[PDB]
Structure 1
Amino acid sequence: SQKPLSDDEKFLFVDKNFVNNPLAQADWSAKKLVWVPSEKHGFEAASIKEEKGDEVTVELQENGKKVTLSKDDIQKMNPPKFSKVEDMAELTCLNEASVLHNLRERYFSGLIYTYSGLFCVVINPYKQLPIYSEKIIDMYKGKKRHEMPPHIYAIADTAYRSMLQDREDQSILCTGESGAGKTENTKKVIQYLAVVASSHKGKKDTSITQGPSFSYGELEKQLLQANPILEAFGNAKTVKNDNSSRFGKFIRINFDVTGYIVGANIETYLLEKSRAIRQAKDERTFHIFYYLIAGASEQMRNDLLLEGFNNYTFLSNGHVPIPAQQDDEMFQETLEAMTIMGFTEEEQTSILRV
């Protein structure tokens, strides 16, 4: 069949090295297989046992249960060839049930990026996946849209490598409801071009830590570290999202004529500055409030007159913690972000007493 797949690799690449089973090929005799509507499943699989004109008698394969339903209830089941397909445009039966089935069986197999013609569908995994790593970057770098499975890096190279072929300025537009994962994909697009379209001055040094193992450029280091500073002075936990974007942002990355990064500009829209004073039930304020009250060193704690949790009337709900984050070390992280970006040692203390 094909090359074998590593464990990490199986979260982007479909398993296709199996025996050519006669079972689902033989089952094809049930050419009265269809999708029928389901309260639990959205659509479930079932087989037509008579057609009565306008109505159709159907039997659920799953549960053995004969039903009568409409001739327009029944949606058109795809051949077992199309199981976990990369693009929705390849599907012979484009049905609402089939798109739901292909996303569902991809999602539970861990494949969270699926193409859909000229745009993609990305489902939030709520799970750390290995697919974001410095191995994966040089696999997608320069590599065509059908030579690798769909991924945010593929879209990021595709925009970069259309712009230098047509010569039209590009936007990558993240859509979706509140908690959908747009901010993380936005950070993945910036991560990709911060090493693909960056100017290089030499390799080394590698620490003793994890491996995002690349010596990113001087500007590109600052561009990488721009996002956590604005997440500190701008993200807050809501009921829906525990690092909820409480401002909107448009990041314009500028290029030369060769195609290398030369500048970047961040425009910004609606800041929910109303939640600084009072918060909704079970919600947090702007993260920097938690980071500064917890993580401030004993000398600066008296200098900036920082009083404890529940000693400030602009913290409602008391001391709401955040799950999978420790606010104490996030103060050190966001201080290290400010030093790397280019803020002076006194200049940073001036920010904190505000």
Structure 2
Amino acid sequence: AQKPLSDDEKFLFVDKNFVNNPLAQADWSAKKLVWVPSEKHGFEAASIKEEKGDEVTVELQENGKKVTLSKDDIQKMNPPKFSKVEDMAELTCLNEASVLHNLRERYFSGLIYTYSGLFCVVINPYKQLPIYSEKIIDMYKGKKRHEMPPHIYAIADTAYRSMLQDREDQSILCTGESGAGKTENTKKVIQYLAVVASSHKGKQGPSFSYGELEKQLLQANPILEAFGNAKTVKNDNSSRFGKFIRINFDVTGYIVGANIETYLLEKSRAIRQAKDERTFHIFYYLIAGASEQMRNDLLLEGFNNYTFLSNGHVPIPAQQDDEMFQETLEAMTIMGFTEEEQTSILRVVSSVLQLGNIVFKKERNTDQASMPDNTAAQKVCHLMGINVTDFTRSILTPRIKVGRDVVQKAQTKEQADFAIEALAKAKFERLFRWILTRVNKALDASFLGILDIAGFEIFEINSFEQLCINYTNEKLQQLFNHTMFILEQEEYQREGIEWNFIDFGLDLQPCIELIERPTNPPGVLALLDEECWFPKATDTSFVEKLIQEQGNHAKFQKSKQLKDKTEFCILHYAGKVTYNASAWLTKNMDPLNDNVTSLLNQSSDKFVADLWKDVDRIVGLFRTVGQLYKEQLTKLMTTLRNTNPNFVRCIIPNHEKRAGKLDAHLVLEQLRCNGVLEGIRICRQGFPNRIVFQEFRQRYEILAANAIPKGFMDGKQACILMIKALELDPNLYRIGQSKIFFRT
């Protein structure tokens, strides 16, 4: 009976304009209508016919087939009115059958994001839905949530608003597997603040005049795609990196500081390419676009006459390394690298060819390996703003100091060509993070933290790069649980407030243990930290130690007999993956040498002094990559613990990259994985917010001038006066001992 809804705006507002049918009210006569289990629909519709103790001959009202089923299988039927709803928590009947059901008929109408009590579900459409421009800023601008339907700019204001209100320091974390949509629901928030939270020299579609700091703010991505991507078996050009932002605010709340961080790289192949694979883009290009003159000047050895351009020249389908030389030479200029820097990035071809060569090639005789090329270190440390001798010294001999004993010693290949693969590829990483420095430099009471996860994946050859990819996912996931199940109901016992305890079985820590648990029987990372520090230890004995320690665990699985390849299939929250272990040992090691970290801490040049002032973690006695990246994710995860986790929970419909295609069982897998039904089952029950009764008495005495008359009593009862004089409901609040627990 309302207005016609726009064709577009159907993707924002529910199609409400349907028909007053009597059938939905007559049909109730079939009073044993129930939801029943189904592999294809998830659940479906049936009716009890005959009560056999705990069985009942239930009968389908789709197929008509009698199926004797149990009192516990049959799940309560929801009323027709709840179709495709705005919040999932409204469904009177919560039970898996139907908590699943809300999404299927919804996404196909256009309606992607949906509120689910505390968190919000954000499925992928794979379609350019028009829901952005200053129309959608200023529609949603400064907006109390109820006036703007379930879509992203509501989370974005609610960050900026709450921070100046409840004054929790707010954060934004986007979750869910690969493709799902996280990267992009991060960038859109930078668009939001650049106009809204900034300030203005005085003062539509894309157009408005943002300030100066706010203009610089954007121009980063296109370079790292050449010097970082490399030809695989799955994809001849796939990326391998993933990111974060903090946003510091002044006294008045404006954008003042902004701090971007990226996490880890496929940093390994340069000195081991598999048969028919290729290396980092640019090498092949410098040999190809090689004019004779700079073939002599830039120190070019020829096609195949290389240590580790394996498989000779493997070509590439539909790309020609020749011309691609020029295009990828062009990109570096935009956010700003000079020609000193670029004759240097020409010898950063010589430095990624020689970061195929700054590797302490396993020294067969002594075992503790050493630096092949001076010129390579010379290229490197000058282009990391420290010193070249001071580097290599430390990178062989840590000149550390415990007690009397100046712990001066050699590092092994694994130790030294780890702190120098952990710095050939924290050259490739903290120099990827030097691109990140060249941004943050112009970018830095209150702050906003935001996180673009590298998204849960399955290659065929998964490796530490993916061990971490489907670790961040998993690590963020036990944050979610501890925040939203356990600690919650603990406080529910506490306050004197009526609520009985429910357990959900949502400690996903068992898969996370299975990777991350240091003591007790250790998991993948912990066995590999130990194995990284180990001579008797082969990527082989890593998987042998994994079978040895884990084996029988109800989230773990061996290889498909390929002990020979040495690989392990595991149940992570979102099901299963195979990792392969060849050359993993080193990939867990990063023993962050403080000798270098401190020269980097006290570095001179425009490059480094900023990005290494994170001196805390560093080996004063200590950490690996596995550990470092548990810890980097703890610098994140435990200050995230002490911020507000606004989660933007992205959900995959298909693995077929397709428009349209949902699979309800793939989604139902990712619901059990994301811990959805139970994240909704807590937030239906209790009371998300929590504050005391004074937030009642003050801010509204103005609202009802008569409310407390001559005389005063207890704060609870006195606020209860203006409370009932503004009709505030006896279960909307929970006036507890200290806290008013407030619902949604």
Normalization by structure 2: what TM-score?
0.39
Contact map agreement 1:178 1:240 (CA 8 A) in 2: no
More moved, 72-81 vs 16-25: 16-25
Shift of 1:249: 2.6
Shift of 1:212: 3.2
Give the Cα–Cα distance (whole angstroms) in 2 for the partners of residues 332 and 9 of structure 1. 44
Shift of 1:102: 0.7
Structure 2 residue ranges without an equivalent (≥5) = 348-743
1:77 to 1:165, Cα distance in 2 relative to 1, 3 A: same
More moved, 52-61 vs 293-302: 293-302
Give the Cα–Cα distance (whole angstroms) in 2 for the partners of residues 263 and 134 of structure 1. 23
More moved, 8-17 vs 274-283: 274-283
Contact map agreement 1:34 1:76 (CA 8 A) in 2: yes
Shift of 1:161: 0.8
1:234 to 1:157, Cα distance in 2 relative to 1, 3 A: farther
Shift of 1:163: 0.5
CA displacement 1:178-200 (0-9 Å, x = unmatched): 44322222222223223322334
Shift of 1:201: 4.7
1:214 to 1:122, Cα distance in 2 relative to 1, 3 A: same
Structure 1 residue ranges without an equivalent (≥5) = 205-210
SS of alignment partner, residue 48 of structure 1: strand
Alignment partner of 1:280 out of 261, 274, 279:
274
1:48 to 1:163, Cα distance in 2 relative to 1, 3 A: same
Q: Which of structures 1 and 2 has the larger relative contact order (alpha carbons within 8 angstroms, sep 6+)? A: 2
Contact map agreement 1:76 1:93 (CA 8 A) in 2: yes
Shift of 1:118: 1.4
Give the Cα–Cα distance (whole angstroms) in 1 for the partners of residues 115 and 164 of structure 2. 23
Give the Cα–Cα distance (whole angstroms) in 2 for the partners of residues 138 and 201 of structure 1. 20
Give the Cα–Cα distance (whole angstroms) in 1 for the partners of residues 225 and 310 of structure 2. 20
More moved, 234-243 vs 177-186: 234-243
Q: Which residue of 2 aligns with 1:345?
A: 339
SS of alignment partner, residue 115 of structure 1: strand
1:254 to 1:144, Cα distance in 2 relative to 1, 3 A: same
Give the Cα–Cα distance (whole angstroms) in 2 for the partners of residues 131 and 298 of structure 1. 53
Contact map agreement 1:276 1:314 (CA 8 A) in 2: yes
Shift of 1:96: 1.4
Give the Cα–Cα distance (whole angstroms) in 1 for the partners of residues 27 and 281 of structure 2. 56
More moved, 243-252 vs 307-316: 307-316
1:312 has 2:302 as partner: no
SS of alignment partner, residue 131 of structure 2: coil
CA displacement 1:140-170 (0-9 Å, x = unmatched): 1112222111112211111111011122211
CA displacement 1:308-334 (0-9 Å, x = unmatched): 999999899999999999999999999
Contact map agreement 1:113 1:123 (CA 8 A) in 2: yes
Give the Cα–Cα distance (whole angstroms) in 2 for the partners of residues 320 and 125 of structure 1. 37
Contact map agreement 1:221 1:341 (CA 8 A) in 2: no
Give the Cα–Cα distance (whole angstroms) in 1 for the partners of residues 313 and 66 of structure 2. 55
1:334 to 1:123, Cα distance in 2 relative to 1, 3 A: farther
SS of alignment partner, residue 172 of structure 1: strand
Give the Cα–Cα distance (whole angstroms) in 2 for the partners of residues 74 and 323 of structure 1. 55
More moved, 245-254 vs 325-334: 325-334
More moved, 312-321 vs 332-341: 312-321
Which protein is richer in strand relative to its size?
Answer: 1
Contact map agreement 1:179 1:241 (CA 8 A) in 2: no
Shift of 1:173: 1.4
Shift of 1:83: 0.8
1:102 to 1:170, Cα distance in 2 relative to 1, 3 A: same
Normalization by structure 1: what TM-score?
0.75
Total equivalences in the alignment: 348
Shift of 1:307: 12
CA root-mean-square deviation: 5.6
1:139 to 1:352, Cα distance in 2 relative to 1, 3 A: farther
1:300 to 1:317, Cα distance in 2 relative to 1, 3 A: same
Q: Which residue of 1 aligns with 2:13?
A: 13
SS of alignment partner, residue 186 of structure 1: helix
CA displacement 1:130-149 (0-9 Å, x = unmatched): 22333222221112222111
Shift of 1:34: 2.0
More moved, 315-324 vs 122-131: 315-324
1:330 has 2:301 as partner: no
CA displacement 1:279-334 (0-9 Å, x = unmatched): 78999977888999999999999997999999999899999999999999999999
1:78 to 1:295, Cα distance in 2 relative to 1, 3 A: farther
Shift of 1:7: 1.8
Contact map agreement 1:84 1:106 (CA 8 A) in 2: yes
Give the Cα–Cα distance (whole angstroms) in 2 for the partners of residues 308 and 202 of structure 1. 60
CA displacement 1:11-44 (0-9 Å, x = unmatched): 1211112232223233333342222111112212
Give the Cα–Cα distance (whole angstroms) in 1 for the partners of residues 244 and 127 of structure 2. 26
Shift of 1:72: 1.0
1:166 to 1:330, Cα distance in 2 relative to 1, 3 A: farther
Give the Cα–Cα distance (whole angstroms) in 2 for the partners of residues 338 and 158 of structure 1. 37
CA displacement 1:210-263 (0-9 Å, x = unmatched): x53444433233323335566676677989999976334331122222222112
Alignment partner of 2:289 out of 291, 295, 301:
295
Aligned identity (percent) is 99
